[PDB]
RNA sequence: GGGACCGAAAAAGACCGACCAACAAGCACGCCC
RNA sequence: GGGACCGAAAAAGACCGACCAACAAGCACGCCC
């Protein structure tokens, strides 16, 4: 087997080696020092003996606070005095004092103010938080200050939400009950995250827009840009990330309305009143956000480089996670990209030796990714034609690790049979599963709901660089990383801030760098089998299986309405119709891929090629209703959280809040054409695994 | 050599035996006779040796005439007394008076009114007649009845301009200035218009939407529908056409001012004043416009037969053309219809012999043509995935003559050298080039403006079946015809008359049916080249030469306001770079094609995937602006007239009467976008022939 | 035969830039003499 | 230890239709006894 000697060729200690060499200084998008290690990775690739490497660059917004006008939130009394100031940087990390170049915390993209006035707590901003505020509180964020805890969704949806509900302002803060695991220590004693330590992050809603001035094109030398008025996703109100002690003094004085129940108090010892404004004496102070952050179009660096195929060099497997970091990215991204690095390190000794893939490899070392997935989209923009005609899959390498309990795997359903398969010969790095597999250590730990005696997959939504290649291009895409048991939909603790370093993984999360190893494994295999296997390791009947769980789950949401349902006719007849034939259709193609034979070349391309672009015939390009990049009818992330991956997603968004609707018939005639879509692209789908002719 | 065995197959007299066959009685879309035709059709084609021959049915908005109600113009006084009315049908020609079922000449999609009031004149009804009306003659046509002759432009922007204009009603009329030969016979006694005559036709504006109940998607049993009021390109005002006889009627007694020049004067014995309202007496004497035609979804039936490929059967080669008729339908479409006939009877006997195409070859007889191409669009939407993933070109079959002059070709430039070559391995069929070649009579009668000792070959617009497969899915088309000598922009005179017969044809165009035997070999031979050659016979170094013409004119069209260039900074810099590179590449992958080993399947269905896909990489999946189903960037119908095709159609919208533009900034902002998608589009479609990998 | 207007890129055709660092503007077909 | 509110499909999980011709609704984790 020729996997095994690419796989025995992954050494934990190179990676050791390659994330200690990431990690030491900050490599923010945009700055000279990614720039610098940008070059460093195109320089070693080289020398690993990849066949080209090259620099794609793209000339994006990005957002940077001013140094000599710094962003902080204070507590203001009706005099004007600032008598409570929010920190102005993190407390820095020992052996990291004398370290110049961290970006203080800040929201990307935030907009410029100093707005003042009366706090409101929001709890996680989600849209069922704001409903609960407004529906049943009869509270109103209307001109008021919105304070808001890190977790559950985006905090881009967050800032969405809150500027909806007529908020002039949100305050982000890390609250313990998410962010401080019981009985561990804060860093550097441990893994939770200080009172003093603050996730950074973007707070675009660009719906896979990629680069705000230049949707749907390339950001190159001579693009024509947007109006900063008329850019994509841009939030209209101030926003600030702050710690869990600056969180206490703003959320202790609260007034107005008691929390409405449990699910709305976190873990510090405060009442987590709900507001408008502070109690009794205090009411006539005012929390005031100073925010002089500047958006500026800055020049991005993709490294791409390139292992040619002997065989099918028309045909591309992409390995790609992102380089850019809030500061150190200790995790995120660095566990991944010192995996990418491996691999490449290990395919390249493989070309040395004079060993080459079947179909093309390329590995891509993203920029801009924390700034909204920009260099992956940039450059998925400018090659979008190769791609869609090329392009056999895409795997994502961000971090490896966000925990060290079992796999997590999110993709396509045409990748369900290849991680079984592979994870079944691969050793499980788990206590107490030596000589087990990691198929039985992984199945163990995190079950399926959804199918008896298989592990946990989940779906692919967005937040990470395979957006644009799955949910725009429809490319089969897939990830995987090691992680923590299930707190829940909030992170590690240690996320974005500037405490996330080399020691924090090496002392806490994988001293052994086995968990890295074991992703590596993955990534590295699955990339293998698809370069190199002589039929492409995808199972259309795992598509057709959850096709069928998709559709009764939609029907079962709809069934939420079921008198509207009688009274406008709504019928999923086609959609489950449709369904059905892509299992018979699957069927048959399956016999077919079995039977017919593989020496012959051109009968191989023809059914490759039905696999490579089964994935394809999902997308719309007319895009789905008010979101035109995301064009996956079976799959696209949640409206209300961007992390979150709905199937049928245009007749999820026509079912959601559909009692609301003003017009019962035009809302209810939307999801009937949502209906209508999803069959027809099902059955377009199935035919494309029909006989050719 | 196979094609000669092909080309020799081919019999004039079957081609006369089938027209006979296809035109003695209506194929009206959405009536029996048409699905008989279809079954008789789909019969034939199987006995000819096909290997497969379906049925594919739609069901979508037609437009009938009540025939108990029927539709007429009157002169109406201001007692009320209808003092003259327009004919209710064509008197029939002989041998034809006992003929039921001729569908009474209507304007299909017409709206149903009864609207009375004074005629104004409007010439062709083109934006520039609406401009010189208004801007310069300021006439305003305002809650006026429009009388517009036929000619120069498609007659549904004829009804769109004037429904712009505030006009209530359209006459449309057939001037013998443009519909009379000078010093030939009126039908049967010749080929001319006689004064009943009456061209049918639709006024939809449907920019390429297919069905206007269901844009995007197939008509099929679940489709979803528009309400009538939201579907696509639906004129708003009532719209009759009528002859010669009865539109000097309505013509004579026109008051207002005189015409401003010749090129507003006809050829009937009337002023052509422009009124609005009629001379001193007649003043108070108006028209009044009877519509009762009703729209109705109506089922219409594609006949889709298959020659599976020996080698690349999931590669398509598509020749098709309409089968629906407004009435006989003698020239448009039954004599291109019974020349698909003889090259299907033809690929069959080759079949029976045990010969077939390398690649699988599709013929189509598409249904409801008349009524905007929506049997051919409704497949393409059903099929798009497929078509954009196998679909190696589109032969366009719509009528075989207009005219014995000579060969008139439109396709992609890919087309340009197999276009060449085939008709210079041709006899002409042209009196004093016996013994010549079809490319001599041709290049001498039809020069190229654009290439010295070149045949004419002209753009591809819409008008025809050809254009979702080229304009929306980026699949190389061409059609081929013999046409008149260039009266200009008008058509044949008989053109969608009830005097259109078989007759017409034998009589006066081609007793001997060698016009049509020539334009089957043209079109046949395509096909077959397509369809055989071991490398698909597009030559790129034709686009890369066109785009540099078509650069030198969008420039030269921008130079009308060289002021706001300068203003505006509009630099085409970047379209000019992208061309240069396109001819580079376009250069190099020449030499690679020319060089490289055609015995290598792999490295051969490589090239041939580079050639396919070339005019792909001109789609943009967004389309133009504010027409979002033409995505060609190279090329799309005129905004003003769909039969007419423009070159960086995105461009040449942008600035299309610019300087009326309110703001100017935006206006020219358009421009420099445009300008930027053209250039990256060149670039992206120029990197697709670049190495792999 | 001669003359007058027009034909707003499907230019109908032919041809023609440094006191906007080569791609505007400007000689067949169909009321007067 | 027991109890109470909540967790609005990434359902966290388990399980459960003819006086809307099988796919609603309805038993782990984080103030009172
Ligand atoms: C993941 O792993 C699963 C489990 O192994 C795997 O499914 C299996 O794939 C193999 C390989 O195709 C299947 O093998 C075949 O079985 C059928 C009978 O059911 C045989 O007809 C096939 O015939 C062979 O004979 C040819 C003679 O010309 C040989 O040259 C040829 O190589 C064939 O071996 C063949 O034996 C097997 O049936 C399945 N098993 C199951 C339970 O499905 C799957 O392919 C892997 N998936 C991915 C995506 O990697
Ligand atoms: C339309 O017609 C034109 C005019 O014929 C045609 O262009 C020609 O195509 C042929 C076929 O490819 C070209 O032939 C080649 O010329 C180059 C030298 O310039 C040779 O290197 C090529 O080599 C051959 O040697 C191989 C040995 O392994 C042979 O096995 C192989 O078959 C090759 O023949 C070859 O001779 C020719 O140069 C051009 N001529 C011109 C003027 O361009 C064009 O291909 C046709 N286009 C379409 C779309 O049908
Ligand atoms: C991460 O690892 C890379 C790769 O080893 C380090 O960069 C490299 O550092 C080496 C050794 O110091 C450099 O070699 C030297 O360069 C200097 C100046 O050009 C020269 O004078 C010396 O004689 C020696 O040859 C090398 O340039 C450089 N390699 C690359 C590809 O950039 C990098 O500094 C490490 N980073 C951290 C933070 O540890
Ligand atoms: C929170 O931060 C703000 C801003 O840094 C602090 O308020 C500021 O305090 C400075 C220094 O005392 C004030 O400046 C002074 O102004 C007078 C002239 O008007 C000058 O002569 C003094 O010598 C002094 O420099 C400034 O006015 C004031 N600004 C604002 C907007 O409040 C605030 O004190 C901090 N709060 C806490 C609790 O630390
Ligand atoms: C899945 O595959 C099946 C089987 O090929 C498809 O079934 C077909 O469904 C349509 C109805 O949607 C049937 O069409 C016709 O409808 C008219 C109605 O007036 C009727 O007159 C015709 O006789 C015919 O019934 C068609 O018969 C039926 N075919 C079979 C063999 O059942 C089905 O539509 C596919 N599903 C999707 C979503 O495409
Ligand atoms: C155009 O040509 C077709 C093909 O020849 C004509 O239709 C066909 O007419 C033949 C000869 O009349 C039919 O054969 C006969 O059918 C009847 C009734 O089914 C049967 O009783 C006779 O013994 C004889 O077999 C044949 O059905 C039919 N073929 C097809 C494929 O439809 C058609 O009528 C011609 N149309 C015109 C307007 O000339
Ligand atoms: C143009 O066509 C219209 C409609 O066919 C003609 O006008 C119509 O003429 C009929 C027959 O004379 C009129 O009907 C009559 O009505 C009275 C009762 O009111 C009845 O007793 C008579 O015996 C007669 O049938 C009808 O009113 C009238 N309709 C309209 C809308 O005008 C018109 O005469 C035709 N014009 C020419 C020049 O042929
Ligand atoms: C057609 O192909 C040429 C040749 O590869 C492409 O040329 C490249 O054009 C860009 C400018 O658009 C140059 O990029 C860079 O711009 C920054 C500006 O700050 C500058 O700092 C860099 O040094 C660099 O000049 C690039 O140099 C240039 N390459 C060459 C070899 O001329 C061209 O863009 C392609 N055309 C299109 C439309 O893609
Ligand atoms: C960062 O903040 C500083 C201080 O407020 C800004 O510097 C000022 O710039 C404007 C010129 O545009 C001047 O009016 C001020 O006098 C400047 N002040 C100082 C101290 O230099 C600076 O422009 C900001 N940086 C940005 C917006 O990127
Ligand atoms: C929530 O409070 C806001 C802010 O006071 C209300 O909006 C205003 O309502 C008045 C009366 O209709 C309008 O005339 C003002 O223009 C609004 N003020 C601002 C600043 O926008 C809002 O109506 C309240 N919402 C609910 C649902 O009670
Ligand atoms: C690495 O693995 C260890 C061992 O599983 C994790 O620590 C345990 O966490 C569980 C509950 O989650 C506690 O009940 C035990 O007290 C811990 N076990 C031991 C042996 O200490 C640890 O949390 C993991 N590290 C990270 C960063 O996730
Ligand atoms: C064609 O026109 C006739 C005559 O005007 C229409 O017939 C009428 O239909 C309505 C019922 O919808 C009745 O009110 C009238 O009494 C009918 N008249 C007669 C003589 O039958 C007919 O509906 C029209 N056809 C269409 C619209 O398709
Ligand atoms: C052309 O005529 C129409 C119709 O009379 C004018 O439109 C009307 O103008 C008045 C005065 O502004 C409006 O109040 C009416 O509502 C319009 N009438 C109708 C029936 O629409 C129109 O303004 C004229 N256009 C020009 C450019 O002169
Ligand atoms: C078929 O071809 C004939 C011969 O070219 C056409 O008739 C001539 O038309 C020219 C001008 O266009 C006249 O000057 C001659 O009087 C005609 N020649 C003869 C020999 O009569 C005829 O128009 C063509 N038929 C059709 C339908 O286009
Ligand atoms: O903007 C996005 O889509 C996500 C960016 C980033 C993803 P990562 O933190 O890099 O996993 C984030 O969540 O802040
Ligand atoms: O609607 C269209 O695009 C054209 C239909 C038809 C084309 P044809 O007459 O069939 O050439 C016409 O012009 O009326
Ligand atoms: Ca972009
Ligand atoms: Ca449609
Ligand atoms: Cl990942
Ligand atoms: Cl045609
Ligand atoms: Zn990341
Ligand atoms: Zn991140
Ligand atoms: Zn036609
Ligand atoms: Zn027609």
Same mark, same amino acid.
């Given at each position: 087997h020729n996997m095994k000697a690419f796989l025995d060729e992954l050494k934990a200690e190179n990676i050791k080696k390659f994330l200690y060499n990431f990690t030491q200084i900050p490599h923010l998008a945009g700055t000279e020092q990614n720039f610098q290690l940008a070059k460093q990775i195109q320089s070693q690739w080289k020398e690993f003996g990849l066949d080209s490497v090259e620099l794609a660059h793209y000339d994006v917004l990005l957002s940077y606070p001013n140094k000599t006008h710094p962003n902080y939130i204070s507590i203001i009394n009706e005099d004007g005095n600032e008598i409570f100031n929010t920190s102005l940087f993190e407390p820095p990390p020992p052996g990291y004092? =004398?370290?110049?170049?961290?970006?203080?915390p800040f929201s990307a993209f935030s907009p410029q103010g100093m707005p003042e006035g009366d706090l409101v707590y929001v709890n996680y901003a989600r849209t069922e938080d704001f409903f609960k505020l407004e529906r049943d509180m009869k509270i109103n964020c209307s001109g008021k200050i919105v304070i808001a805890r890190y977790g559950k969704v985006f905090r881009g949806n967050k800032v969405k939400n809150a500027q909806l509900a007529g908020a002039k302002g949100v305050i982000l803060y890390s609250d313990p009950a998410d962010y401080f695991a019981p009985g561990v220590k804060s860093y550097p004693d441990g893994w939770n995250l200080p009172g003093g330590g603050v996730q950074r992050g973007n707070i675009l809603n660009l719906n896979g827009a990629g680069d705000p001035l230049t949707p749907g094109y @390339?950001?190159?030398?001579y693009a024509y840009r947007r109006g900063i008025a008329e850019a994509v996703g841009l939030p209209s109100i101030p926003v600030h990330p702050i710690g869990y002690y600056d969180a206490q003094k703003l959320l202790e004085k609260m007034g107005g309305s008691?929390? @409405?129940?449990?699910?709305?108090? *976190?873990?510090?010892?405060? @009442?987590? =009143?709900? *507001?408008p404004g502070f109690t009794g004496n205090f009411s006539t102070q005012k929390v005031k956000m100073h925010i002089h952050s500047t958006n500026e179009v800055t020049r991005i660096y993709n490294v791409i480089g390139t292992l040619r195929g002997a065989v099918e060099p028309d045909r591309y497997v992409i390995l790609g996670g992102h380089r850019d970091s809030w500061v150190f990215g200790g995790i995120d991204p660095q566990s991944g990209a010192a995996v990418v690095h491996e691999i490449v390190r290990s395919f390249g000794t493989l070309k040395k030796e004079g060993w080459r893939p079947r179909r093309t490899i390329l590995f891509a070392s993203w920029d801009a990714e924390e700034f909204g997935l920009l260099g992956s989209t940039e450059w998925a923009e400018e090659n979008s034609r190769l791609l869609q005609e090329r392009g056999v899959a895409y795997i994502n390498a961000d971090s490896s690790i966000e925990g060290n309990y079992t796999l997590r795997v999110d993709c396509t359903p045409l990748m369900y049979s290849l991680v079984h398969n592979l994870t079944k010969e691969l050793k499980s790095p788990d206590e107490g599963f030596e000589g087990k597999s990691l198929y039985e250590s992984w199945t163990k730990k995190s079950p399926s709901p959804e199918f008896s005696g298989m592990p946990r997959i989940s779906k692919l939504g967005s937040g990470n660089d395979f957006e644009v290649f799955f949910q725009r291009l429809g490319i089969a895409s897939g990830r995987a990383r090691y992680t923590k048991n299930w707190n829940k939909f909030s992170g590690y603790p240690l996320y974005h801030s500037v405490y996330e370093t080399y020691e924090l993984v090496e002392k806490f999360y994988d001293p052994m760098f086995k968990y890295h190893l074991t992703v590596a494994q993955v990534r590295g295999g699955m990339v293998f089998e698809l370069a190199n296997s002589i039929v492409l390791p995808f199972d259309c009947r795992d598509y057709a299986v959850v096709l069928r769980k998709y559709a009764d789950k939609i029907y079962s949401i709809s069934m939420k309405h079921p008198q509207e349902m009688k009274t406008y006719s709504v019928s999923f007849d086609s959609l489950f119709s449709a369904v059905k034939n892509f299992t018979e259709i699957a069927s048959k193609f399956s016999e077919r891929l079995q039977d017919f034979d593989k020496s012959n070349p051109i009968v191989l391309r023809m059914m490759n090629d039905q696999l490579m672009f089964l994935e394809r015939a999902f997308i719309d390009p007319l895009g789905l209703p008010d979101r035109p990049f995301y064009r996956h009818v079976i799959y696209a992330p949640s409206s209300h959280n961007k992390y979150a991956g709905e199937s049928f997603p245009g007749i999820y968004d026509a079912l959601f809040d559909i009692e609301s609707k003003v017009d019962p018939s035009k809302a209810w005639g939307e999801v009937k054409r949502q209906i209508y879509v999803a069959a027809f692209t099902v059955q377009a789908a199935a035919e494309t695994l029909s006989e050719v002719a």
């Open positions: 004092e =004398n370290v110049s170049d961290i970006v203080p @390339p950001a190159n030398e008691a929390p @409405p129940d449990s699910s709305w108090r *976190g873990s510090l010892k405060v @009442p987590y =009143n709900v *507001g």
